[PDB]
Amino acid sequence: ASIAQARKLVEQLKMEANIDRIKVSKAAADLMAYCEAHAKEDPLLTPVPASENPFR
Amino acid sequence: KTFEVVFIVLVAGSLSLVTIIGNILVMVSIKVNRHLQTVNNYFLFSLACADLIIGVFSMNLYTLYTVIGYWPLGPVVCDLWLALDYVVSNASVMNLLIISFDRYFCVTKPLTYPVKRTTKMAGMMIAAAWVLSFILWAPAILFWQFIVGVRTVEDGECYIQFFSNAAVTFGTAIAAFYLPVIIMTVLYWHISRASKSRIKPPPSREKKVTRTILAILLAFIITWAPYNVMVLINTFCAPCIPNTVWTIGYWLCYINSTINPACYALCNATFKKTFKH
Amino acid sequence: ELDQLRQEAEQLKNQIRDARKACADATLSQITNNIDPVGRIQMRTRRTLRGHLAKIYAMHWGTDSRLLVSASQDGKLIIWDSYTTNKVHAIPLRSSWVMTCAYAPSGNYVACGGLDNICSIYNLKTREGNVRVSRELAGHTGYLSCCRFLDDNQIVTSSGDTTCALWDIETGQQTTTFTGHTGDVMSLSLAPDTRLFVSGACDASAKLWDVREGMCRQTFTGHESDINAICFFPNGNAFATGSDDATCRLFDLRADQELMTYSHDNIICGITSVSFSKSGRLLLAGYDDFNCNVWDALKADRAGVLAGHDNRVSCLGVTDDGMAVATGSWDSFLKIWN
Amino acid sequence: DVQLVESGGGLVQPGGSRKLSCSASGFAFSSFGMHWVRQAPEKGLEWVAYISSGSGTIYYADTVKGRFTISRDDPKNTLFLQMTSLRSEDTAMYYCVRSIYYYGSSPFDFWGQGTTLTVSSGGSDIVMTQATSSVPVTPGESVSISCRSSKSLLHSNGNTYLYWFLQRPGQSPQLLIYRMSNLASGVPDRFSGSGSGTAFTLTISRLEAEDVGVYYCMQHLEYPLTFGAGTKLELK
Amino acid sequence: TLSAEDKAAVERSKMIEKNLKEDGISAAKDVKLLLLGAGESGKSTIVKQMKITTGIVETHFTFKNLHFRLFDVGGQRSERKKWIHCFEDVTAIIFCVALSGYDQVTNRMHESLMLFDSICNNKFFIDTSIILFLNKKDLFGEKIKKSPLTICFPEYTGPNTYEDAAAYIQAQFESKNRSPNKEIYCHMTCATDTNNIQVVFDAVTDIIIANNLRGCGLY
Ligand SMILES: CC(=O)OCC[N+](C)(C)C
């Protein structure tokens, strides 16, 4: 009955509650470093001259 | 003299302002609103452009002419202005005719016609109307005197020269007025007849349709009728027509251009909802 | 014994919340108070692809960033050429109700699905000319929402029966099934390494699956309504979920918690599609109020609007080299922007 | 599976006429472009005509315009060539090729088998020259074949329209590399092509006894299509 | 032109665009419907009397050089609001109500009324007209002769005859719309009735004519 469902739910929660967590400061610094380390290769926020733009 | 001229100038300016404001309102409303923009509105756009041109140029220059009393700029400008006026008037009439045809084909052939009428067909029909009006009016008006090899326009007036000729003015007037009015009234009778209820206090759907049809047809006929009837009595016997009635007539034809934004572009509730702004 | 297990689950979730609270020391807004704003990113329409007759529901780019696929309820799956606005294939479908499409990374196959509960696979490089149906997968008990190609041999689908599955196209059998959701599943995005993926459901939750063991790994719950679009960050350590409560949020895998929400009091209509840029500095999100938005993903402030559609935008996607972005709305048109 | 078989050749007196047929079976005939290519008893290959899918555009060679007519009947998936006022220089073997065209397709991928035809006695083209004529080879050795043109084949689109064909003796030509370095379907990885503008080469690695024959180069930049004299490979 | 053929590709594009146009033209002579209702409301009966497995089940039929597509979507047992946006732009909606709603499942008639209210005021169906079928009209006579109608509607005040009660039910159902751009057609249908395709036909024609009049601006 509901015993199997409850056992599955608690097993899932226990399995999920054993994961390493890093600090949010690092998890934001990594994102910002990736964003600023690829600024020159993103042709969207840095407009491309019409000499190399393939759609115009 | 003292007050009559200023009164008629004020009336002409008021009508010209109304015409321009209505046309520009139509033009802006078509562009700005996504809902209002549709493939069945390019005809209204073309009609608005024609009405605007007629209003500004024809109304203002003819007002100046009728007040001062004689054509200032000489025969060349007179011929150019007459050609432009007649061409754009015929373009307006042809736009009305194309709208009538579109409504007839959309109502009588409901399912297949809307998809078979691509956006290119609309532009083709507008181009056909404008080009046909241009070919019919501009060449003859500009080159009648060179062809017949004599010029009779007096230096004290500005009117089309081949009005003396019988067959040509009959052909132009008969076509330009009497053909589109007959086509329009026949098509609108067919639309009204085929718009009843077939099943088994709001007003019945046929009542609104008939009201709009009568409004459109009366608005066209009452304005454009006085001018063309005097042409046919003029071509045989000129002295019958007094001078004052001709101006009133030439002007009513202009007044017909004021109410086109009302008759054609104020039936959809979206126009009025936008117009509150 | 139901009450005891319920209490155990309550204790487990309390521990989860306490750990999440402990692991947070600052906010991404605080650390990003010094970076340079991107300014007004003005984009212009370059091409308009007008072939369809009904509302467009899905669209996927090609691996070479030139070929494009689109699907609609006119019964057609026509693939385009972006540079020349040419039509190169037109594939008639069996069911007009189509809500997803995919285009294989190698370029040989495409996929389709919808209310018919069947994911179809087509071969484009056949020896005899015209395209033909290769497989017709049928294992789901509800409408499909999103399908992605692992490779030419295996595909992953998400359906509205609260399950996701991984198929073997050669045999045609449902190799693995993923379960754990409560409501309909409506979105799916694969990792850059294609070793794991996420899925957002209509119970306001998103899960982190693993394609090998077939077991959910993390559960993220921040939204207040159904989630309609997910997309990974380019580095594969974060994703953005656009939900139906007129907001979108960014989640981080390792931190296991929300990072930043992108909302504005002038916005009330919900999201339909979400995609990033090649560097992750921009977030593009479709909307129900007939236009699209661009968000400075590191500052949560608007940085442009992509107007030009007069109905709901339903699909959105940037190319694999980041040169262009394509959108498609319910007015049967599709645009390209640079 | 895919088959192109022709019929209608034989002995013709000068001044007569003949009708050649190309019956196809195994593919979507109605959505393909079909060519006609003839080969002299000892010379190389020469292009004859072309008809597009839907019979929209038809092209003819310079030496057959006004005498030959090419038409197709795709409901019965057969291709025709009507010939009028034959001369002594029209005696050759006529082939039938399919040339599906779209973005990324491989034209000239399948060739017919050919019908003989013998007749008894009664400027702006892009010339392409293959200086090499015949070279000896041995198995296990690498050789290079060169084909040069007179106009640059590098279009502004970035494409370079050069096609390489192989004709083993007593057989019909095959497509090796198309436009100008892509590898065709079913051809091994040994073959490779390179070049730029007007000088091109074909690289063969680990030559065996099965890839012996004559190699031809063709251009597709602008009609008429021009072939080359071809280079013959024979065992040393 | 500067095209390097590179020009049969354009020809192919034009040919398949022509095919798309031809397919679109030929797919505009079939009317798309949508059948809604509840169990035991007789919505299967109207399908059965109309002449000629998960997913969308259809009832593909034709009548008088106009082609019809009846989509029955009662088999999709999932969230309704997540796939009804693709079912808009249908010509009409067919709603079936059983007149013998005199028992619990609340009274079935009240559930039907609530569902009709929900479907005629949805944001995707504000402008789509509804054709309403009142099924099982033969049972209703004996049911109302045996039992009164006040069990369903306490505020009923009038004769207990067939005509007045039927008119009251029809008015109660027709008083659920507020949009002036749509109309509700009604019909009393027995369990076994002669014609029910003509009623769909002459209503769909009226819907199409009204839509054309509105679009032209002549309305
Ligand atoms: C075309 C036509 O005959 O009408 C005359 C127009 N009008 C009176 C403004 C000059």
Coordinates of C-alpha atoms and ligand atoms in Angstrom, one line a residue, chain B residues 85-86 89-90 137 224 227 250 253-254, ligand 1:
Chain B
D85 CA -6.6 66.2 -59.5
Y86 CA -8.5 64.0 -62.0
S89 CA -10.0 61.3 -58.0
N90 CA -10.3 58.3 -60.4
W137 CA -6.7 60.7 -67.4
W224 CA -20.6 62.8 -56.8
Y227 CA -21.0 67.3 -60.9
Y250 CA -16.6 70.8 -58.0
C253 CA -16.7 66.1 -55.2
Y254 CA -14.1 67.2 -52.7
Ligands
LIG1 C1 -12.6 61.8 -62.1 C2 -13.9 62.7 -62.2 O1 -14.5 62.8 -63.2 O2 -14.3 63.4 -61.1 C3 -14.0 64.8 -61.2 C4 -13.2 65.1 -59.9 N1 -13.2 66.5 -59.6 C5 -14.5 67.0 -59.7 C6 -12.6 66.6 -58.3 C7 -12.3 67.2 -60.5

